[PDB]
Design an enzyme around this catalytic site. Structure first.
Site, PDB file in Angstrom:
ATOM      1  N   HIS A  10     -13.826   1.246  -7.988  1.00  0.00           N
ATOM      2  CA  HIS A  10     -12.483   1.227  -7.444  1.00  0.00           C
ATOM      3  C   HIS A  10     -12.272   0.063  -6.574  1.00  0.00           C
ATOM      4  CE1 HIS A  10      -8.552   2.821  -6.678  1.00  0.00           C
ATOM      5  NE2 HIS A  10      -8.748   2.889  -5.349  1.00  0.00           N
ATOM      6  N   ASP A  32     -14.666   3.449 -12.466  1.00  0.00           N
ATOM      7  CA  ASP A  32     -14.012   3.938 -11.257  1.00  0.00           C
ATOM      8  C   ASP A  32     -14.175   5.457 -11.143  1.00  0.00           C
ATOM      9  OD1 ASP A  32     -12.027   4.584  -9.239  1.00  0.00           O
ATOM     10  OD2 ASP A  32     -10.971   2.735  -9.798  1.00  0.00           O
ATOM     11  N   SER A  71      -4.873   0.939  -5.659  1.00  0.00           N
ATOM     12  CA  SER A  71      -5.050   2.356  -5.272  1.00  0.00           C
ATOM     13  C   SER A  71      -3.650   2.995  -5.167  1.00  0.00           C
ATOM     14  CB  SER A  71      -5.848   2.425  -3.947  1.00  0.00           C
ATOM     15  OG  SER A  71      -6.256   3.719  -3.535  1.00  0.00           O
ATOM     16  N   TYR A  72      -3.323   3.585  -4.018  1.00  0.00           N
ATOM     17  CA  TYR A  72      -1.983   4.102  -3.760  1.00  0.00           C
ATOM     18  C   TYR A  72      -0.902   3.044  -4.020  1.00  0.00           C
ATOM     19  CZ  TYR A  72       1.378   7.472  -1.984  1.00  0.00           C
ATOM     20  OH  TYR A  72       2.421   8.390  -1.876  1.00  0.00           O
ATOM     21  N   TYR A  89       0.835  -1.212   0.000  1.00  0.00           N
ATOM     22  CA  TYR A  89       0.000   0.000   0.000  1.00  0.00           C
ATOM     23  C   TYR A  89       0.876   1.271   0.000  1.00  0.00           C
ATOM     24  CZ  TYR A  89      -3.838   3.258   0.345  1.00  0.00           C
ATOM     25  OH  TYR A  89      -4.715   4.284   0.082  1.00  0.00           O
TER      26      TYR A  89
HETATM   27  C1  LIG Z   1      -8.468   3.886   9.255  1.00  0.00           C
HETATM   28  C2  LIG Z   1      -9.014   5.121   8.877  1.00  0.00           C
HETATM   29  C3  LIG Z   1      -9.778   5.913   9.746  1.00  0.00           C
HETATM   30  C4  LIG Z   1     -10.308   7.137   9.321  1.00  0.00           C
HETATM   31  C5  LIG Z   1     -10.082   7.595   8.024  1.00  0.00           C
HETATM   32  C6  LIG Z   1      -9.322   6.815   7.147  1.00  0.00           C
HETATM   33  C7  LIG Z   1      -9.072   7.195   5.879  1.00  0.00           C
HETATM   34  C8  LIG Z   1      -8.704   6.375   4.889  1.00  0.00           C
HETATM   35  N1  LIG Z   1      -8.546   7.155   3.825  1.00  0.00           N
HETATM   36  C9  LIG Z   1      -8.150   6.717   2.469  1.00  0.00           C
HETATM   37  C10 LIG Z   1      -8.884   7.610   1.449  1.00  0.00           C
HETATM   38  C11 LIG Z   1      -8.095   7.810   0.168  1.00  0.00           C
HETATM   39  N2  LIG Z   1      -8.942   8.513  -0.791  1.00  0.00           N
HETATM   40  C12 LIG Z   1      -7.628   6.435  -0.385  1.00  0.00           C
HETATM   41  C13 LIG Z   1      -7.178   6.545  -1.692  1.00  0.00           C
HETATM   42  C14 LIG Z   1      -5.899   7.029  -1.892  1.00  0.00           C
HETATM   43  C15 LIG Z   1      -5.408   7.186  -3.176  1.00  0.00           C
HETATM   44  F1  LIG Z   1      -4.153   7.676  -3.318  1.00  0.00           F
HETATM   45  C16 LIG Z   1      -6.203   6.847  -4.270  1.00  0.00           C
HETATM   46  F2  LIG Z   1      -5.747   6.988  -5.519  1.00  0.00           F
HETATM   47  C17 LIG Z   1      -7.487   6.350  -4.061  1.00  0.00           C
HETATM   48  C18 LIG Z   1      -7.978   6.193  -2.775  1.00  0.00           C
HETATM   49  F3  LIG Z   1      -9.165   5.729  -2.612  1.00  0.00           F
HETATM   50  N3  LIG Z   1      -8.816   8.370   4.182  1.00  0.00           N
HETATM   51  N4  LIG Z   1      -9.133   8.427   5.390  1.00  0.00           N
HETATM   52  C19 LIG Z   1      -8.794   5.589   7.588  1.00  0.00           C
END
Ligand SMILES: Cc1cccc(-c2cn(CC[C@H](N)Cc3cc(F)c(F)cc3F)nn2)c1
Ligand SMILES: Cc1cccc(-c2cn(CC[C@H](N)Cc3cc(F)c(F)cc3F)nn2)c1
Lengths: 724, 724
Positions: free
Chosen positions: B700, B668, B590-591, B507
């Site tokens: 996604h 997506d 994703s990432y 990740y």
């Molecule tokens: C465990 C926990 C608790 C609260 C918020 C979160 C949280 C998790 N995330 C991930 C969201 C982010 N859009 C994930 C993501 C990163 C990317 F670089 C990408 F291309 C696509 C994605 F969905 N944001 N906040 C996680």
């Protein structure tokens, strides 16, 4: 050494053409190094007409040129920007040849859709923002003929998508009268035609993908509508919106949906039109005279000719064009006779019957030229081979006096001819395309002596003696009481006792011909030459040039016989015993990808693997003009049943037995990504594994330099692997 | 026998949960077979609260239920229809529990976007066509609070795309006051936010693909704007458009672009808000009191608290939420201290300073509950392991009196706890997630005795003794003077003297944790158990829970250290000598698809192959709120340089050295197909062969039942082949 993949992709072994345009009855232009010469066919002397260095300070790369027929001006096309198959936009400068100056007054605007001289003199018609404009003199203001043009809705002098691709096979929907008096043009209303919308991704720079919107009638959708007009280009008021005299259609057409499907001028004041019913088994020709007192146009109900079929559709892809005699009181036109063979019929303007001036169990391909003495036509009669193509002349005074002009010129090297006549048919060029190396020769009509050899590709011939070429076998096999042709590309040193792996190269579409005498250097050359793979093709039911009984076999039946015959064609190649019947593959583009996909989905178990490139997956997704021509309407009263019964998606299960590579360009306007995306979904739903490849921003040709190389490289790995 | 792919795809070995909702300070609801019971924690007795057959004639499959806090009504969600990550629409019937009737008057409309009870009693707030509506009694007419709601433009009480995904992590943008007097709600104006447009293909039936249009701010594009409002739900005129008292923002926010980033009620008339600058290093909290005479809301400039960072961004993904003491004059909040570690700070409403009530070289994860005596928090302090998670209590009267409630409950089976407290924190559930089998137990706060074992998955435990499970090693390695954690899934009977093929499961994103103590049955389980493949993971720089020094390392540097550390991590796994250093692969979603792509494009030559699933390829294509939080603006004054220097496209060439599988869902909305399509185009431009797979209409998560199976099957063949 051997014909390798790079040899093919980098084009190391060139074929040479000889490209000329006739400017008189005895003079044509050839390009050389960068100079445009003019070869006088009469003596043989040739003169610099235009010099390579004439445009060094021009400042733009010149995509194309067009010389006015009267030699006075040259049109300069640059800033070319492809649209669909034949369409594009460009910018245009006009250069004065009498003087030596680029016209700076009243120039042709940037982004022009179409441009054309009048056939005599030097008038210009040009479409721009969907609207027609005329220019009598290069430096003078332009008379705007049309006012109604509107993007993706109104098309004046240009075809909309479906008319471009499926009807007129060009972008231009205008037609000069033989001397330049009248400008016939058509008009397309796309208002209620639905849009296909797909993404274009562009350069990495572009941050939001563009959405591309195109008026595109899928099967049974709302069609464009057409209106036709004629204009007098002489009486052009520098102070009145010019009057376009509309010709309307016959009343047998006006009952239902129709397409305008041909525009041929007969005389200086007589134009012919052909109309087709949306159900494409019924065509009508009109002949329209200019009433010099009324300024109107009149099409006599007695001069109408009807063309119709009961066993299928009218024409090969459309009705054929007429060829009017000097006076314009009779014409020649190709039709299938009672036994279903496309021959020449002789028509009198106001007589319902015609007279066949050829018959046989073979077909005329096209009428090439007409004098007061002779009609020249190309046919596949010679040696009874439909894959062949020859020039003949028929005596107008004596219909039993037919000479073959090409048949014997080089029997072994040359069995596929095309012809280019000069004005009034004084001289002609013959292009030989196989089975030997392309051969370009000049000829005078008068006594038919072969003046000179223009190109013989001996240059390539030298180069190829050093390379283990594959050989080509063209032959037939009898299935019922019909003979069906096929061709093999055989690996060099073909040992009939070994067991070779076979690749069934597929098109199969209605009126196709994948078995012919043509000389090709393509992917298959590499597959045989280097990978010792037999690449076969087979023209079973549905296919062209062998009369309606075969071609119409698939009428309202697409994805049945043509598909089954391809499987059969493979069974039989195994019965020849030089084929490893555990290493048989199949591949195809466009229609052929459909057939490829249909075959793997048949569970015939004959085939190990297959590649479908930009396949149709369901007829309802393809455009209407094509789909309907063969299947009718997809409503439960017409043919909705065969429409629903002929998809690749319903054969999804059987893919379990095969290895499948599905390849599609994302920006295909023609066979939309959807077709491939519905297959992939279908397969995924029944848990079939397969292989996929999309091509960003590529269209239906996947023809950009880098994608072309990438796709073919990728398919080779796939084939190699599949065959060990 | 062994843990096979089907075992994973067909879910043959189930993990069991224990899902309860607290309805009082001593009663919770459990579902059983189809019956909703109510377990009294006080005695142990449990009673049928709702019977499996109560809705057999209901006529609809019931997706979800919600019981009003005062036990009087039950909300019935059916016709669920997912939108984005948390968002969906549904229909709702209300059932009267006092009686036994479904309310037929003034029903909640079809296609409702959000629905919720008041925290006390039984009022309903519900959003519909983008507009808020209140219902004081199930059968009475609904007071339409908002009038401005408009599709894809105005969002009342719901988040737009970017706020849903990247800010509030829910669809609902509304908040009751603790007793039900006030309905706080936010408003989103998306007017000038650009649209992402992609195709949806639907059922084979659908003849033209739909184009999907979503307001989506890519990096540096025009953001949505927010306004906040509060309403009095009591004074609701059945004859006047209710008055929404807007709270506006601090003036330090109003200078530039901002986001609302938290909404926590403190008391019955005191609400807290948190605002964030578009440049996300500066946060401000507001505390707003109800002026009972003016009906207005007043946020004292002396009650503002500022949160900011100099080494990176504020919060983990946002600032943390406050936890207000009964009176609402103090709150607890997690912040990184001076040494960069997230701990609990004790705040007085109007005092600028806070007091840290924890410190250490570890982090508080979250504040779980607050009484007048105790604050309960989860932290990764125990055994100094950041992949661990435990329940602790701190004495409010004595900050040096900390008890660990979980640490010792089962040391070997249990190192990852989460907690669910009852109202007023009388009882709590502890959820153990590994490293052993999930274990669910009940506990009373009073003296911390372990009432009962609710679920111990002994049922699964039996099942698994018959199966060769892989073992899991969690450990660390030192790189500079920092220790970085990793985890290996080791194939059963792991012989440290052999040489195993390794798959680096990636990740890597800012604040990630792929190395923990959690017990998982996923794809890796199959790869180790059956294919004897080591599946490793490594939390290097950028990763969470180990203080700002590590996490902020990639501030303004995405696609650098986190990428390099992953390559490093693999070098080191080779130095342990049980790894065949000619069969190392890498994969990611994703990432992690990004990081997987960046790595293969690094030409480090460590890695044979890689799979990138729905990767980001270029940061300018990802949404603004996420991307900017780490990279700033992509203008040449801010950070445009690192933006342009961190794309997968520029590493195109190096893919020559690797085998690459790129997989993306066409529909997506989160990481758009563009990102993948720009990669494939880049690779095709430099003539790199690779492997592709699109997924029609998947998003996604590629999570539809059939696609999930297909993708994972497909990736296995790929991995197998890659490793012989
Ligand atoms: C465990 C926990 C608790 C609260 C918020 C979160 C949280 C998790 N995330 C991930 C969201 C982010 N859009 C994930 C993501 C990163 C990317 F670089 C990408 F291309 C696509 C994605 F969905 N944001 N906040 C996680
Ligand atoms: C040799 C020759 C001479 C004149 C016309 C033609 C000709 C060829 N065509 C094919 C037009 C049609 N759009 C082909 C086509 C078929 C498909 F099934 C498909 F999916 C996509 C296509 F473009 N129409 N006319 C061919």
């Amino acid at each position: 050494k051997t014909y390798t993949l790079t040899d093919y992709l980098k084009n190391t072994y060139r074929l040479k053409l000889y490209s000329l345009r006739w400017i008189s009855d005895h003079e044509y232009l050839y390009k050389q190094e960068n100079n445009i010469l003019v070869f006088n066919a009469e003596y043989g002397n040739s003169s610099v007409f235009l010099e390579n260095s004439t445009f060094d300070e021009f400042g733009h790369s010149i995509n194309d040129y067009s010389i006015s027929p009267d030699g006075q001006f040259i049109l300069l096309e640059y800033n070319y920007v492809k649209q669909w198959r034949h369409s594009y936009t460009a910018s245009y400068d006009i250069y004065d040849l009498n003087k030596r100056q680029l016209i700076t007054e009243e120039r042709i605007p940037n982004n022009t859709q179409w441009v054309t001289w009048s056939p005599v003199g030097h008038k210009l018609a040009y479409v721009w923002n969907n609207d027609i404009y005329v220019k009598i003199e290069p430096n003078l203001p332009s008379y705007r003929i049309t006012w109604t043009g509107k993007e993706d809705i109104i098309y004046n002098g240009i075809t909309d998508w479906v008319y471009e691709e499926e009807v007129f096979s060009a972008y231009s929907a205008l037609w000069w009268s033989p001397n330049g008096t009248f400008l016939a043009y058509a008009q397309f209303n796309d208002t209620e035609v639905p849009l296909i919308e797909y993404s274009f991704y562009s350069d990495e720079s572009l941050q939001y993908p563009k959405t591309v919107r195109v008026p595109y009638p899928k099967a049974g959708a709302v069609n464009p509508t057409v209106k036709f007009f004629v204009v007098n280009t002489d009486s052009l008021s520098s102070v009145t919106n010019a009057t376009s005299i509309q010709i309307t259609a016959p009343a047998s057409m006006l009952i239902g949906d129709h397409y305008l499907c041909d525009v041929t001028w007969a005389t200086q004041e007589r134009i012919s039109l052909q109309w087709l019913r949306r159900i494409q088994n019924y065509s009508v020709m009109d002949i329209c005279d200019y009433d010099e007192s009324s300024g109107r146009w009149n099409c006599l109900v007695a001069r109408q000719h009807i063309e119709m079929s009961t066993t299928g559709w009218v024409g090969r892809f459309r009705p054929s064009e007429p060829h009017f005699t000097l006076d314009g009181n009779s014409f020649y036109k190709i039709i299938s006779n009672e036994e279903g063979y496309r021959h020449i019929c002789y028509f009198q303007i106001d007589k319902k019957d015609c007279t066949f001036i050829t018959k046989g169990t073979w077909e005329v391909i096209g009428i090439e030229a007409l004098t007061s003495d002779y009609l020249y036509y190309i046919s596949n009669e010679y040696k009874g081979m439909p894959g062949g193509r020859n020039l003949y002349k028929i005596q107008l005074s004596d219909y039993t006096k037919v000479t073959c002009l090409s048949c014997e010129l080089n029997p072994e090297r040359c069995q596929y001819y095309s012809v280019s006549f000069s004005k009034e048919a004084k001289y002609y060029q013959l292009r030989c395309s196989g089975p030997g190396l392309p051969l370009y020769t000049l000829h005078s009509s008068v006594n038919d002596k072969g003046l000179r050899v223009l190109e013989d590709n001996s240059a390539l011939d030298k180069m190829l003696q050093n390379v283990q070429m594959p050989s080509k076998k063209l032959d037939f096999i009898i299935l019922n009481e019909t003979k069906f042709w096929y061709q093999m590309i055989l690996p060099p040193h073909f040992d009939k006792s070994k067991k070779y792996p076979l690749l069934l190269d597929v098109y199969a579409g209605p009126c196709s011909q994948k078995a012919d005498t043509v000389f090709r250097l393509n992917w298959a050359t590499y597959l045989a030459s280097t990978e010792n793979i037999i690449v076969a093709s087979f023209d079973g039911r549905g296919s062209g040039y062998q009369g309606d009984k075969i071609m119409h076999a698939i009428n309202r039946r697409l994805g049945t016989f043509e598909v089954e015959d391809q499987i059969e064609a493979a069974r039989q190649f195994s019965k020849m015993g030089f084929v490893d019947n555990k290493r048989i593959a199949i591949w195809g583009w466009s229609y052929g990808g459909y057939v490829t996909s249909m075959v793997l989905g048949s569970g015939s178990g004959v085939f190990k693997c297959g590649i479908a490139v930009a396949p149709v997956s369901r007829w309802e997704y393809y455009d209407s003009v094509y789909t309907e021509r063969y299947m009718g309407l997809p409503t439960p009263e017409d043919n909705l049943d065969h429409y629903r019964n002929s998809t690749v998606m319903s054969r999804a299960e059987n893919f379990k037995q095969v290895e499948y590579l599905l390849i599609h360009g994302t920006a295909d306007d023609n066979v939309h990504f959807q077709q491939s995306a519905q297959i992939s979904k279908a397969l995924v739903d029944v848990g079939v594994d397969f292989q996929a490849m999309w091509y960003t921003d590529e269209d239906h040709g996947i023809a950009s330099s880098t994608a072309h190389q990438h796709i073919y490289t990728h398919m080779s790995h796939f084939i190699k692997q599949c065959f060990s």
